[PDB]
Automatic annotation (TrEMBL), chains A, B:
Belongs to the cytidylyltransferase family. This is choline-phosphate cytidylyltransferase. It comes from Plasmodium falciparum (isolate 3D7). The chain holds residues 615 to 775 of 896 of the full protein. Residues 7-123 form the Cytidyltransferase-like domain. CMP binds at residues 11-12, 19, 96, 114. Phosphocholine binds at residues 11, 49.
């Protein structure tokens, strides 16, 4: 079948199984895909979304080890635009309003978040070996 | 060139960039490889080595997302034996004495550990936003 270009973006701070499962989902939306992953800048993430432990370089270097990732745009734009989709020949944006135009264009594909598998979740599990009393 | 079967093992608890860089190194020891990764059992890890946050299932499920990993043995034996190498047709063991026979057999390849990129290291970085005083 025709090769389909998928775009997913995010912070990917302290990359965990939840991120990887969502990237896998994006990658497998069609039989033959190219998965482009956008990694948000440190200053725009901190300004608009919240705290980030790892630098852009660190978050991008880690993502390059994930087998579902074909291409990385680092840093990606904070807001996705139609021109950005045209430039990279993106067929669908995979993500979990502001995204209204994406859906009007037929270029929206939903992916799911997995609960309970984040890196901070693991640290919470470590902490529970220490009873309050 | 001939395809070379590489075997690496470990706990792979809270998989981080240091693990992935070592798996990449193992995978790229020769131009054409099959990288088999062994994941140690919960009870043997806890008995012989130390504490483990994530279960065998969790550690194995995460490792399957790493592009360098071709095959996973889960659980792997705690001690690697010549018979184990014969069974899986392993040409080299990549790791960073007990391993004396591996080197006598020509089946030892050294890989390096990367400092300062572990998951706990990241948590330590979070904690430093909170001054002692």
């Amino acid at each position: 079948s025709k090769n389909v270009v998928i775009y997913a973006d995010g912070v990917y701070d302290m990359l965990h199984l939840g991120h990887m499962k969502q990237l896998e989902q994006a990658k497998k939306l069609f039989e033959n895909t190219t998965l482009i992953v956008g990694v948000t800048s440190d200053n725009e993430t901190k300004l608009f979304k919240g705290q980030v432990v790892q630098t852009l370089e660190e978050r991008t270097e880690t993502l390059k080890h994930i087998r579902w990732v074909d291409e990385i745009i680092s840093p990606c734009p904070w807001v996705v635009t139609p021109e950005f989709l045209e430039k990279y020949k993106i067929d669908y944006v995979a993500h979990d309003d502001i995204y209204a135009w994406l859906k009007r264009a037929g270029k929206f594909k939903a992916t799911q978040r997995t609960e309970g598998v984040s890196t901070t979740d693991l640290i919470v599990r470590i902490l529970k070996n220490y009873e309050d009393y």
